[PDB]
Amino acid sequence: APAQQIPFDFDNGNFIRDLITTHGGGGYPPADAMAPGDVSSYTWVTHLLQTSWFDALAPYHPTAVGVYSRIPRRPAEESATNRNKNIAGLYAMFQVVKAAFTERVPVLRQALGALGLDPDDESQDLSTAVGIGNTAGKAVAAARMGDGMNALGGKDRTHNGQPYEDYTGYRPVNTADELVDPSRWQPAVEPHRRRTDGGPGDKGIFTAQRFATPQLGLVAPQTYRDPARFKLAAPDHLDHNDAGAYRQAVDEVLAASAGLTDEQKVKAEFFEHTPLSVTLSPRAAAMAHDLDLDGWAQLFLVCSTARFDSLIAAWHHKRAYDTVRPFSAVRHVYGSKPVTAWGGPGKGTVESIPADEWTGYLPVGNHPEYPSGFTTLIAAQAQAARSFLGDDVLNWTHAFPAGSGQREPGAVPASDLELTWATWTDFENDCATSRVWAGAHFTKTAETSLAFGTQFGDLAHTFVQRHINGDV
Amino acid sequence: PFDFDNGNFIRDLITTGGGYPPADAMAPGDVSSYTWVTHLLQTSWFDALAPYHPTAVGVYSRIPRRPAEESATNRNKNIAGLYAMFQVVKAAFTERVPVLRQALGALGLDPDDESQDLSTAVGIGNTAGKAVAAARMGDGMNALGGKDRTHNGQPYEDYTGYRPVNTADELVDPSRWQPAVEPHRRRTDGGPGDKGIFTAQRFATPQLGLVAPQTYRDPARFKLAAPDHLDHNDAGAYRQAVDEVLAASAGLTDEQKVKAEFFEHTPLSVTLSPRAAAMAHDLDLDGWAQLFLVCSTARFDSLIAAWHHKRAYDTVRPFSAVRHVYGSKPVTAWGGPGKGTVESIPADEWTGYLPVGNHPEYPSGFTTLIAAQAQAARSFLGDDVLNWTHAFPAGSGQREPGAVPASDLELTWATWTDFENDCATSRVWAGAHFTKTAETSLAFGTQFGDLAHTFVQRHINGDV
Ligand SMILES: [Cl-]
Ligand SMILES: [Mg+2]
Ligand SMILES: [Mg+2]
């Protein structure tokens, strides 16, 4: 309803917990223009969003300073309640949304109006919460909208630019029709409605994949400068000239496909679903650790910084190694010969699906295979939360009603399902293995990605502590 | 309120100007899947009405003729046509099932009635619609996705093994089609899709050239001249074709931009031009079903032939040809949204006003189809009269919303000849086609309207 108001206690509430990250604890969130499996654009925009929270609250802190702005500190009385911090954080992310997520502006404008806040207030009075928030959010957008991500589309061109357009000149050595180098990434052919549950798009249209925002590997990281300094071993397990090792890596993917259970299917979908598994695991960790509003903003910043910097490094190596995905390797080893694996929707495991008709449980991501973006990112986020919160406790239970699976709706899971992760360690280990259940990654890739991501959580923790303490 | 006895379900319900219709899962510019599914829908109308006609027989079914008293009013014919297309929707357009179920319920018809009593309108309609789907869902279009595979098939999947000789990144043969790189939200107004994702084009349903046509058996028998204007080894002719496209781009007016969008909007220009012709000729319900079948048959068979030649000639689109001729050099053309004509847009940053279609250039699908449809309506209705006016309020353009057109605009086509001539030239304004391609496509499509008229008359007369 146009006049409906949102109940929220500005004085004692927590806008991150009570407004932004609220959910019923079951199923998947509503869909919008950001596809849940598109981790690169998701991680980039979410970092702008969640950093604006921290920068908006920093002047209300006794010592903290912002990442992208330095706003003169407020008297302590302005933090006696959470009202100013709540207002400032909301306006800061509103500025980021207006700059980087214009699709969300109408819903956010309506939510702000329902909270009693003027959605057209562009004041930048630095003694007011709205002015601090607007200033902090604008500073994040001003520093990042023109970064290497090309989020506005103007990089290296003057006409007809499109947001997130690749300006780096990446070209695969394989086409979707011909596997010239079986060690190298090959674009998949996918229906235009390309999400796990179909999703938005055009009926009867097919496309060939393009490397998703390869320029991500070039954007300025938050805690370091050059992602090449984080060395990653070569993916020797996928050298097609070592036919025995290549075939073993393929057979492990097919065996994972053949062994799929309801729980593995749901976990495959869960860990690829960025607005749920990635965004809301810090919420679960925060709920288990009794953090105040400042602690939530700090935890989310440390997690987002870890995701941001680890994914840049993962994307750098994705392009440098440019590694083949499982579906191409399955076809390379077996051609049209039948294999034992998932037969497709409603089919369960079958003994004789032709290898060139096999597909992973989830639609394969549109970028090279090595390393795993999700696994690197979650390992970084798990380490960041570990370091900030002081322990490994996560205690996240999420419910999946019968038939709520997106790949096989109405059939998977066969009955109501509750998944629980007591620790980040359980969480990140499930993420890595679920990438193999999804058919998106080889076992060794997921294992190496787990080890590769952890270090970025430590860098993120140091970075956020430096800003909490005032950056002197 | 719809009147079953004297009303017309095609006129009063299905095809009920200004602006563009609401968007759904079928993108308006995607002509191949649109024409295929629409032919099943509109053929089911005719087959449902044939037993209620004194002599007509169905295309995909033969239902024993009804007593004339059951055609005294339009009630049975209206009921039968609605259930017939409902059967096609359930088989070939499942996305539309909820809206149609609701529309039938609002009319007082049970959307769960699967009766096939051939003495009742619901039974005749259900039977006529199911026969169309049974005959066509497994044709060469691969609409269900099972062609030449047993696992993980996807509707409309290309089974033909077509691949371009160019990749989206490298133009090796400038005479041949090169797929474009496009944002995933790929429609003129953006459209549904995923933020921040780009794709390389795939030839849209190349198998369309292989599906069994309605009025002939082999599309190769319809000769189409070679696109000599696009032989890159003849640099002068190639550059002339390119420069004509750039000059059309530089000369774009509000009217040309809106007409470019209009003729690429299949649910409007293609679907509703027979409505305008039917309205201008005061046809009864039978005449509407017959006209739409002649038009749909002409579109179906002409587009099959166009798709056959699109694959055989596999010709380059203007954006690739502009890049071949000029590389990065500046040209005079449209500068992009909000910029108008500019003197120095780098050629490798130029784009047509509308997103280029995802199939080879020669011949033009829209132009061939409209020329076939225009001829079909001409032959059936006996004259060239169309008398269609469509309004575009200020700012209603999809490519440049709020700016184009600068003021309220009315487009009028008195005749099919004016309509098809505007369609051909608008493909050049759109940047999608070369001038000679549009001209040749107009000449190529006309013949399929004559074939369609003969085919429908044979069925109207009883197919003896
Ligand atoms: Cl071919
Ligand atoms: Mg608190
Ligand atoms: Mg009538």
Q: Residue ranges of the domains in chain A?
A: 1-169, 171-198+223-472
Put simply, whether B95 touches A (Cβ < 8 Å) is yes
A346 has a chain B CB within 8 A of its CB: no
Contacts of A192 in chain B (CB under 8 A): 184, 186, 193, 199
**Do residue B192 and residue A200 have CB atoms under 8 angstroms apart?**
yes
Contact (Cβ atoms closer than 8 angstroms) between residue A285 and residue A378: no
Task: Give A334's contacts in chain B (Cβ within 8 Å).
Answer: none
Q: What does the buried/exposed string (b/e) look like for B7-42 if buried means 16 or more CB atoms within 10 Å of the residue's CB?
A: bbbbeebbbeeeebeeeebbbbbbbbbbbbbbbbbb
> Cα B297 from chain centroid?
12
Q: Do A204 and B155 touch (CB under 8 A)?
A: yes
Question: Does B413 contact A at CB distance below 8 Å?
Answer: no
* Residue A208 at interface with chain B, using a CB cutoff of 8 Å: yes
**Residue showing tokens 């393009």:** A210
Q: How far is B405 from chain A (nearest CA, A)?
A: 20
B403 three-class SS: coil
Cα-atom radius of gyration of chain A, to the nearest Å? 22
CB proximity B165 to A under 8 Å: no
Q: Tell me, what DSSP letter sits at residue B365?
A: H
Distance, in angstroms, between B76 CA and closest chain A CA?
33
CA distances (Å), origin A126, targets A118, A133, B183, B378: 17, 9, 40, 72
Closest ligand (CA of A89): 2
Tell me if B197 and A175 make a contact (CB, 8 A cut-off).
Answer: no
Q: Give the helix/strand (H/E) hosting B389.
A: strand B385-392
Cβ-nearest to B199 among A164, A207, A350: A207
Q: Pick from B26, B149, B199: which is nearest to A209 by CB?
A: B199
Is B194 near chain A, with CB under 8 Å? yes
Q: Give the CA distances from residue B9 to residues A297, A443, B21, B75, B380, in Å, rounded to whole numbers and listed in that order.
A: 60, 59, 18, 10, 20
Reported resolution in A? 2.0
Length of chain B: 464
- Partners of A397 in the β-ladder: A420
The chain B residue lying nearest A344, using CA atoms, is B152
| Residue A421 phi, psi dihedral angles, 5° rounding | -125, 115
Q: Report the C-alpha gap between A132 and B266 in whole angstroms.
A: 50
Where does residue A321 rank: exposed (0-12), middle (13-18), buried (19+ CB within 10 A)? buried
Please indicate whether, in this complex, the C-beta atoms of B194 and A35 are within 8 angstroms of each other: yes
Using an 8 Å CB-CB cutoff, list chain B residues near A34.
Answer: 194-196
Placement of tokens 């449809």 in the chain? B373
Option in B33, B200, B350 nearest A204 (CB): B33
Look up residue B190 and give its two tokens: 């953006």
Q: Are A253 and A433 in contact (CB under 8 A)?
A: no
Q: CA of B33: which chain A residue's CA is closest?
A: A204
A212–B contact, CB cutoff 8 A: yes
d(CA B83, CA B100): 10
Per residue, what are the HEC states of chain A? CCCCCCCCCCCCCCHHHHHHCCCCCECCCCCCCCCCCCHHHHHHHHHHHHHHHHHHHHHHCCCCCCCCCCCCCCCHHHHCCCHHHHHHHHHHHHHHHHHHCHHHHHHHHHHHHHCCCCCCCCCCCCCCHHHHHHHHHHHHHHHHCCCCCCCCCCCCCCCCCCCCCCCCCCCCCCECCECCCCCECCCCEEECCCECCECCCCCCCEEEECCCCHHHHHCCCCCCCCHHHCCCCCCHHHCCCCHHHHHHHHHHHHHHHHCCCHHHHHHHHHHCCHHHHHHHHHHHHHHCCCCCHHHHHHHHHHHHHHHHHHHHHHHHHHHHHCECCHHHHHHHHHCCCEEEEECCCCCCEEEEEEHHHCCCCCCCCCCCCCCCHHHHHHHHHHHHHHHHHCCCEEEEEEEECCCCCCCCCCCCCCCCEEEEEEEHHHHHHHHHHHHHHCCCCCHHHHHHHHHHHHHHHHHHHHHHHHHHCCCC
| Amino acid identity, position B179 | P
CB contact under 8 A, B156 and A206: yes
After what residue numbers is chain A broken, C–N > 2.5 angstroms? none
B395 interfacial to chain A (CB closer than 8 Å) = no
| List of residues 6+ apart from B36 with CB closer than 8 A | B141, B143, B205, B208, B211, B300
Contact A301, A52 (CB under 8 A): no
C-alpha dihedral sign at B216, B217, B222, B226: positive
List A residues 20-39 in contact with B (Cβ-Cβ < 8 A): 33-35, 38
Rounded to whole angstroms, how far apart are CA atoms B176 and B359?
A: 11
User: Among partner residues A38, A162, A357, which is closest to B194 by beta-carbon distance?
Assistant: A38
- Asked if B100 is an interface residue toward chain A (Cβ–Cβ < 8 A), one would say no
A177–B contact, CB cutoff 8 A:
yes
Name chain B contacts of A159, Cβ cutoff 8 Å. 335-336, 339, 342, 345-346, 349-350
Interchain contact A41–B (C-beta under 8 A): yes
The answer to whether the Cβ–Cβ distance between B194 and A33 falls below 8 Å is: yes
CB pair distance less than 8 Å for B345 and A159: yes
Q: How far is the CA of B311 from the centre of ligand 1 (A)?
A: 6
B55: three-class secondary structure by DSSP: coil
Closest of B411, B447, B437 to residue B356, by C-alpha: B437
Q: Please, after which residues is chain B broken with C–N above 2.5 Å?
A: 16
* Terminal CA-CA length for chain B: 40
In angstroms, rounded to a whole number, what is the distance separating the alpha carbons of residues A379 and A456?
Answer: 8
| Residue of A38, A204, A347 lying closest to B196 (CB–CB) | A38
| CA A49 – CA A145 distance, rounded (Å) | 12
| Range list of H helices, B327-403 | 365-381
Instruction: Please give the DSSP secondary-structure letter assigned to residue B201.
Output: E
Ligand number nearest to the C-alpha of A286: 2
How distant is the Cα of B141 from the closest Cα of chain A, in angstroms? Answer: 10
Q: Which ligand is nearest to the CA of A12?
A: 2
Tokens standing for A37? 């499996």
| DSSP 8-state assignment for residue B388 | E
Would you tell me how many other CB atoms lie within 10 Å of the CB of residue B64? 8
What is the rounded CA–CA span in Å between residue B81 and residue B4? Answer: 12
Q: Check if the beta carbon of residue B114 is closer than 8 Å to that of residue B126.
A: yes
CATH of B186-202+213-464, one of 3.60.70.12, 1.10.1370.40, 1.10.606.20, 1.10.287.610: 1.10.606.20
Nearest CA in chain A to B183: A162
- Which method resolved this structure? X-ray
| Residue A273 neighbours by CB under 8 Å, 6+ apart | A28, A36, A37
What chain A residue is nearest to B144 in terms of C-alpha separation? Answer: A204
Provide the token pair at B135.
Answer: 């005959």
Chain-chain contact of A41 with B195 (C-beta, under 8 angstroms): yes
Q: Is A447 on the interface with B (CB under 8 A)?
A: no
Taking a C-beta distance cutoff of 8 angstroms, is the pair B208, B163 a contact?
no
Is B232 within 8 Å of B174 (Cβ atoms)?
A: yes
Which of B1, B20, B22, B2 is closest to B10 using CA atoms?
B2
> Which of B197, B203, B307, B334 to substitute to test the interface with A, most A CBs within 10 Å?
B197
| Number of Cβ atoms within 10 Å of the Cβ of B173 | 15
CA distances from residue B191 to A152, B26, B70, B426 in whole angstroms, order as listed: 18, 11, 45, 21
> Nearest Cα to A145, choosing from A168, A163, A160?
A163
For the purposes of burial, counting CB atoms within 10 Å of the CB of A229, is it exposed (0-12), middle (13-18) or buried (19 or more)? Answer: exposed
**Inter-chain residue contact A164 with B198, CB threshold 8 Å:** yes
- Is the minimum CB–CB distance between A159 and chain B shorter than 8 Å? yes
Contact between A192 and B185 using a beta-carbon 8 Å cutoff: no
Helices (H) and strands (E) in chain B, counts: 13, 6
Q: CA B404, CA B258: separation in Å to the nearest integer?
A: 8
The fold for domain A171-198+223-472 equals Vanadium-containing Chloroperoxidase; domain 2 (1.10.606)
Distance from CA of A32 to the nearest CA of B (A): 8
Of the candidates A28, A455, A1, the one whose C-alpha atom is nearest the C-alpha of residue A280 is A28
* Pairwise CB contact (< 8 Å): A208 & B185: no
Query: β-strand A206-209 against B385-392: which pairing, if any?
Result: unpaired
Structure token digits, residue A284: 């679960």
Asked if A178 reaches chain B (Cβ–Cβ under 8 Å), the answer is yes
If one counts every other C-beta atom within 10 angstroms of the C-beta of residue A173, the result is 13
Residue B410 token pair:
């009315």
Instruction: Give me the residue label for tokens 């180098």.
Output: A181
Of A38, A159, A209, the CB nearest to B349: A159
Q: Distance (Å, rounded) from C-alpha B26 to C-alpha B143?
A: 14
